[PDB]
Amino acid sequence: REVKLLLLGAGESGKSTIVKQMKIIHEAGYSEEECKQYKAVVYSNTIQSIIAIIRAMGRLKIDFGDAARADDARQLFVLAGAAEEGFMTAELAGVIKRLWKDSGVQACFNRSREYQLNDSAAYYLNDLDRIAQPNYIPTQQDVLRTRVKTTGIVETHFTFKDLHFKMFDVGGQRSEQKKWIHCFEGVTAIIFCVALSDYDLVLAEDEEMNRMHESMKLFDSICNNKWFTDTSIILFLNKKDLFEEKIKKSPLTICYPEYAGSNTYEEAAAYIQCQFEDLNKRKDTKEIYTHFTCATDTKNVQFVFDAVTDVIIKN
């Protein structure tokens, strides 16, 4: 039987990372030639991330820790063009590594909720020595960590448990939300992705709009749309790894002023789950299948999608 899955959710919620995991788990992963295609994306992500931090020190008036980094930051923009083409000279890596270890840069990095920074910024920058090597070939995890905004509709196919899956992925940014209707036909199940760690962030398209509140509005619209009455609604509360770290130091009251629980993972996670599930206007006739995920963790996604497939199989 053919099973059509539709991935929905706000931008950067993890939808395309789930797509990548299906290729890794169910079709032997990315070949060397495929990994090499992502080398330019890894380099682009890395240079864009350090540039975003440097940019933010200017707006937030944060000085470098050592005054010598001013020359490194000059050389950064001089040499950045190579990375945006898939090349990484030993001189550029040294410039980035020194900037990344500077205490003023690190101070700005730890204030990233005051600007826009890729979630994978630290992953790549902490691994600069490995990714800067000659003949560097991105690993599966490197590919999973890449960030490219999805425009259009991405369709991938795979076989699992004798089922032929057709998985559809759409862009989640506001400009792409008008395109969601084009995938609405014949959907067996929806996987709605939520970035748990978005609770203290604002939209790139609007600094006044809380990211998690926008996610709730989208989920409210989808879950209660009569067109999806007979469609299984699966909720991926994603980026649980980033949420577990963030909940220790960033109060959830930024998002939900009425939250009275502790700053611990289990209580706060369950509170967010209930906030989303309470948007369901048909609690007795419509079920939501909620899973907490780390979309970049292949082992976690494999077991979660195994459990999801059983629900789809049983209908």
Ligand SMILES: Nc1nc2c(ncn2[C@@H]2O[C@H](COP(=O)(O)OP(=O)(O)OP(O)(O)=S)[C@@H](O)[C@H]2O)c(=O)[nH]1
């Ligand atoms: N640490 C961590 N990073 C994640 C997780 N899920 C996704 N990411 C990272 O977050 C970034 C955004 O993920 P992505 O898959 O592109 O979201 P998206 O929903 O497809 O975004 P869009 O196409 O609507 S603009 C990527 O760099 C990805 O590697 C997670 O569970 N944990």
Ligand SMILES: [Mg+2]
């Ligand atoms: Mg995407």
